[PDB]
Amino acid sequence: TQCHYGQCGGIGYSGPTVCASGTTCQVLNPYYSQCL
């Protein structure tokens, strides 16, 4: 699971894409999305 300020990931991120409950995956850039 991804944590707060962590990268939930955009196009091409195969890591922790699922943000923790209480954080949202926000697309900041097409490849960089962060769990806020």
Swiss-Prot record:
Residues 1-36 form the CBM1 domain. It comes from the Eukaryota. It is found in: Secreted. N-glycosylated. The catalytic core domain comprises three N-linked glycans which each consist of a single N-acetylglucosamine residue. Exocellobiohydrolases (CBH) that catalyzes the hydrolysis of 1,4-beta-D-glucosidic bonds in cellulose to release the disaccharide cellobiose. The degradation of cellulose involves an interplay between different cellulolytic enzymes. Hydrolysis starts with endoglucanases (EGs), which cut internal beta-1,4-glucosidic bonds in cellulose to reduce the polymerization degree of the substrate and create new chain ends for exocellobiohydrolases (CBHs). The CBHs release the disaccharide cellobiose from the non-reducing end of the cellulose polymer chain. T.reesei produces two different exocellobiohydrolases. They are unique in that they can hydrolyze crystalline cellulose in the absence of endoglucanases. Belongs to the glycosyl hydrolase 7 (cellulase C) family. The enzyme consists of two functional domains, a catalytic core joined to a carbohydrate-binding domain (CBM) by a serine-, threonine-, and proline-rich, highly glycosylated linker sequence. This is Exoglucanase 1. It comes from Hypocrea jecorina. The chain holds residues 478 to 513 of 513 of the full protein.
